[PDB]
Design goal:
Five copies of one chain form a homopentamer. The first copy, chain A, is mostly beta strands. Chain A has one domain: Acetylcholine Binding Protein, Chain: A. Chain A contains one helix and twelve strands. In chain A, strands 1, 2, 3, 5, 6, 7, 8 and 10 form an eight-stranded mixed beta sheet that branches. A four-stranded antiparallel beta sheet of chain A has the order 4-9-12-11, with no helix packed on it. Chain A is globular. Chains D and E meet through helix 1, strand 1, strand 3, strand 5 and strand 6 of D and strand 2 of E. Chains A, B, C, D, E: One of its GO terms (cellular component) is membrane. Chains A, B, C, D, E: GO terms for molecular function: extracellular ligand-gated monoatomic ion channel activity; identical protein binding; metal ion binding; transmembrane signaling receptor activity. Chains A, B, C, D, E: It comes from Aplysia californica (California sea hare). Chains A, B, C, D, E: InterPro entries: Neur_chan_lig-bd, Neur_chan_lig-bd_sf, Neur_channel.
Chain lengths: ~200, ~200, ~200, ~200, ~200
C-alpha cells in the first residue's frame, strides 16, 4: 500500500518522463520473441498472421531507486503508459498490430524494465509451398521506427525464438524460427538502423 | 444522491490511487465463467469464438467504510476506471477480446468488489471432430498477465462452468465445461503464475 | 448565447455528475424500441443484426433548474458524456453494439432527460426457416447490467415495438415486434434484476 | 508572423465552447454533397455503400473578428473539435459512418465556418433492378439528430449533387443525384423538423 | 537525460504549438513515397490496397535552436502530437487510412522536421486487366485536406516512386510508379490546392 504509492509518485510526478535516447545517451533494448501460433495464411493477398508475445527490456537510471528508502521495495508493476517505451515496429506489417495483453510493465530497483506485450500481426509473406514437405519461409524485421543505431541498439539473448508455448494443434507446424540482429545503413538516412529479423520456416500439419 | 457523492470522493480522492497488490500485500481473485454461446468455429485457421461472462471478486482494505457514517449505504456501483481491477487475460487469444458489457463494478462496504465483464473471445482451438457425436475439446487459460502467484492468486467456487443459460439454438452444443485452477512457470520470470483453465467440450447439432 | 452558457456550467462545473442509483434513491427508466431494420441474418453462426434506436427516459433531481435564473429556457441539448446515463445492455449480443447517432440528450427543467441512441446490434438468433410463411422468432433482453430492480426500475409504455419507421424495402418483413417487461434472477446475486424482452417475429419478403 | 496564435486564444480560451443553437438564437447550416463513388451494393443485406464529400457552412457571431486587429488575418484553419459542429446524421445508416478526411474546419473573419468531411456511408437501399438499363433509385435523409427547425435550419445552395468528380471507373454509373430540402411541421408541435433527402438513381456499369 | 529535457520544455512548454501556416506564413511540405506492396485487389468493388511510407519534410523557425545552449544536441525525436503536422490526405480513399508505424517525428536544430508514417490505404481503382501483359493503371492524389496553395505548397525530390524495398514476392509486378505535383481547383473554394499524384501501373506476376 503506502510506500509503493510514495515511490510511484516520486518517480512519475516529482520528476518528468525519460525524454528518449540521444547520441550522447544511447540505450540498448534486449528483444526476444515467443511465437505462439500461425493463425492464418492468405494466399491471394500475400499475408500471414502471427500471434506471439514480445519480451522487451532496457535500463534507465531515471527509473532508479534505493529500496531502503522505500520500505525494502525492490521492484514494481505499473501501467506501460506511466513510463517511456521503445518504438519497436514491424517493418512489413500490412495492418495495424493488434494488442492481445494488458500494457503493464515491471520496473526493478536498479532502473531496469521488463515489458511483454502479446500482439497479433499481419505481415508480408508468400505462403506458396506451405503444403509441401520443405515448407515455406518468411521474415519480418522488428526495430525502432525513428531511432538510428546511434540512439537505440538492439540485442538478443539467443537467436532461437521461444517455441515452448507454440500452439500444439495449430494448422501450421514450425520447422524453425530464428531471431538475428541485423544492421541496415538506409536511403533517406546516413546513420544505420538496427533491427531483429524474425525468420520462420513452417508448413501445413 | 448526497451521501454516496461524499463516499466516492472520500474513497477515490482523499487517498492516491491504489497501486495494486504486492508481495507484502497479496490478493486472491475468485474467478467463475458463465458460457453463453459458441458463436463460430473456423477450421481454416484454428480459431473458435465464445461469448461468456466472467465473474471477478476480490477484497481491498482500502475500499472499506462504516455504513453508519454515510447514511447506511452498504454498496455502490462505480465505473471500473475508478478502481483497481485485476489484469486477468486469456493466455491464448487470437484477437483482442471485445467487451460486450458496461465497465462498471460494484464495491461493498467491507471493501469487496464484484466485476462481471461480458466478452466475445477468439482463441486457439482445433475443431477437427466438431462434426461428430463425441465432439471436440478445447482449453484457454485465464490469469494475470503480470502478477505472479505471490501477488495475485486465483480460485474458483466450483469447477463446473455455468451452462444453465447457454443459448439453446446455438449451432454448437456443449457436452461439458470445466474451470480448474492451475499453476505455471515461465522462462522469463522467477516466480509461479496462477491461472484458471477453462475447458470446453462441444459439437454441432 | 451566454444565457444557456451559464446554465450548463452551473450544472456541470459546480462539483460532480450524478453517482448513480442506490437502494435508497432508486430510479425508474422508461424504455421503448423503434425497430428500424433487420439488416442481416447469418445461418452459419446463428446471429442476426438489428438497426433500431432506443428511447430512454429518466428524471433526476440533480438536473433541475428554475428558468428565471436562466432567461426562460424550458430545455436544452448536451453531449451524453456530460451527464450520467443508465447501463442498458443487450444480454445476448455477439458483438459490441455500434453507434449510429450523435451521443446527445435533451434535458428538461423538471430534471427529466431524453436520450435516444441509434444502434446496430448483433445478437444470438437462429434464422432457420426465415423463408417459410411461418417465419422465425428471436428474442433479446435489454436491462441494466449491474443495477438490481431495487436500484433501477425499468418501464415500458406499450408492449408493441414501433414499426412505423421500419424500412419498407428491408430484406425481412416484420410479423410481430413485442417488448415485454420481466423481472428475473441470476446466480451471482440474491436480488431481482429487471429487463425488457424484445421478441421479434420476422420472415424474408 | 505566426501571431495568429493570439486570435486563437482570444477566441477559444476567452469563454467555454459555444453551447449550441438556442431557439431565440437559431442557425442556418448549408449542406452539399459531392458523390465520389458507389463502392459496393449488397443485394443480400440491403445496404449500399457511398463515398462522398459533405460540405457544411454555418455562421457564428461568436467566432468573428476584425482582421485589422490581428495582423491582417482573414481566415484560419483549426481542428474541428475545438469549435462546435452540427450533429447532422444520415437517418438510415447501418454502420457507423467512416471518416475519410481530417477533422479540420476553416474559420473566416466574419464568423463563417466551412467543414467538408469525406465519408463512407452504408445505408438501407434495395438494389433490385441495378442490373438493368433501367437502374434503381435510393434515398437517405440527412438531418440534425436532436435539433428542431428553430434551432438549426438546413439549406442547400442547389439541388444538383456534384457528380463532376465521380469515379469514372466505378462498377456503378450514376444516372442522377438530387439533394432537396424537406420541411415538416405537425399540429401538437410548434417545431418544424427539416432534412435534406439525398436521392441517387444508378445502375451497374 | 539532462539537456534534452530542457530543450523540449523550451520548445513546447514556453509559447504554445505552431498554429499552422497562413497566406502570410507559407510552408512547403516535401513528399515522397516508398511503395512496399500492393496487398489486395478487389474487382467486384473496384478497390485496391497499398502499403507504403510517406516521407514528409518541412521547416519551422519556432522549432529552430542553437545546439551550443543544449549540449550540442543537433537533433531529437518526439511524438507527433507535440508538434503541428501537415494534414496530408488521400483524395480517393474508400476506407479510413490505417497507420502502421509509431506517430513520432525527428526534429533538427534548424527547425527542420521529418515524419514518415507507414500506411495501408484502400482507394478507388478498377483493376480490370491486372492479369494481362499490359497491366492496369491506378492513380491517387495526396494533398492537404484544408490548406490551399497559398498556405501549404508541395514538392517532390523526384517523380519516381521509390521501389527499392518493394516486396520481393508480391502477387504483382510494378511496371511503373510515378509521383507528380499538380494544382487542382474544386467547386467549394476559389483557390488552388496542391496535390501529389501517385500513378502506379502494375500487373499480376
Amino acid at each position: 500500500q503506502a510506500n509503493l504509492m510514495r515511490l510511484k509518485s516520486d518517480l512519475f510526478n516529482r520528476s518528468p518522463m525519460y525524454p528518449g535516447p540521444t547520441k550522447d545517451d544511447p540505450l540498448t533494448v534486449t528483444l526476444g520473441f515467443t511465437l505462439q501460433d500461425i493463425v492464418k495464411v492468405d494466399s491471394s493477398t500475400n499475408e500471414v498472421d502471427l500471434v506471439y508475445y514480445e519480451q522487451q527490456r532496457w535500463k534507465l537510471n531515471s527509473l532508479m531507486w534505493d529500496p531502503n528508502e522505500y520500505g525494502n521495495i525492490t521492484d514494481f508493476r505499473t501501467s506501460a503508459a506511466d513510463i517511456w517505451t521503445p518504438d519497436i515496429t514491424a517493418y512489413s506489417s500490412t495492418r495495424p498490430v493488434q494488442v492481445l495483453s494488458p500494457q503493464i510493465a515491471v520496473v526493478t530497483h536498479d532502473g531496469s524494465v521488463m515489458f511483454i506485450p502479446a500482439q497479433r500481426l499481419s505481415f508480408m509473406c508468400d505462403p506458396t509451398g506451405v503444403d509441401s514437405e520443405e515448407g515455406v519461409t518468411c521474415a519480418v524485421k522488428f526495430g525502432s521506427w525513428v531511432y538510428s543505431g546511434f540512439e537505440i541498439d538492439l540485442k538478443t539473448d539467443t537467436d532461437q525464438v521461444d517455441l515452448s508455448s507454440y500452439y500444439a494443434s495449430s494448422k501450421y507446424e514450425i520447422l524453425s524460427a530464428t531471431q538475428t540482429r541485423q544492421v541496415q545503413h538506409y536511403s533517406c538516412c546516413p546513420e544505420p538502423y538496427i533491427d531483429v529479423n524474425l525468420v520462420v520456416k513452417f508448413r501445413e500439419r
